[PDB]
Amino acid sequence: VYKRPVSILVVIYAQDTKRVLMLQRRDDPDFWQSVTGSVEEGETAPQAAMREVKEEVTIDVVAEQLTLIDCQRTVEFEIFSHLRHRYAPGVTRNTESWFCLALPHERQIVFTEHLAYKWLDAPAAAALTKSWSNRQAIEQFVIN
Ligand code: NI
Ligand code: NI
Ligand code: NI
Ligand code: NI
Ligand code: NI
């Protein structure tokens, strides 16, 4: 069914090294990203952020007593041409809200939506992703 054009982004990084967890998409294997996901009907952006973090990298933020920071930033961007097919007819814009998740250390990731994961220094991660909003969020909330 159609993806929804309201989404979240969670920049996951490790507090000690400042390396950024990057995940390799399966629909576009050249697309490495932080965690993104559609906000579903009747759920809030923070709810979606926590749900997608649990789904995509098997990190439970409530149980692990971690802190999902609302970055208080929302941007809108054009859906990539070759991925637009997954949205309702005529949907071309996506509105995305930003979140931060600092883990104490780099760790092993069990992932489900992706092909592979890498821990990268924040400029490398920012330079790797194809999404300008993901790049901006790493620059603004990891690098400072
Ligand atoms: Ni996702
Ligand atoms: Ni999803
Ligand atoms: Ni997902
Ligand atoms: Ni999904
Ligand atoms: Ni420790």
Swiss-Prot record:
Q: Where does Mg(2+) bind?
A: 52, 56, 113
Question: Which GO BP terms sit in this record?
Answer: AMP biosynthetic process; ATP biosynthetic process; folic acid biosynthetic process
* EC numbers, comma separated: 3.6.1.67
Q: How is the cofactor bound?
A: Binds 1 Mg(2+) ion per subunit.
Q: Which Pfam families match?
A: NUDIX
Cofactor dependence is on: Mg(2+)
- Name the chemical reaction catalysed here: 7,8-dihydroneopterin 3'-triphosphate + H2O = 7,8-dihydroneopterin 3'-phosphate + diphosphate + H(+)
Q: Which family does it belong to?
A: Belongs to the Nudix hydrolase family.
**Function as written in the Swiss-Prot or TrEMBL entry:** Catalyzes the hydrolysis of dihydroneopterin triphosphate to dihydroneopterin monophosphate and pyrophosphate. Required for efficient folate biosynthesis. Can also hydrolyze nucleoside triphosphates with a preference for dATP.
What is this protein's record name? Dihydroneopterin triphosphate diphosphatase
* Gene coding for it: nudB
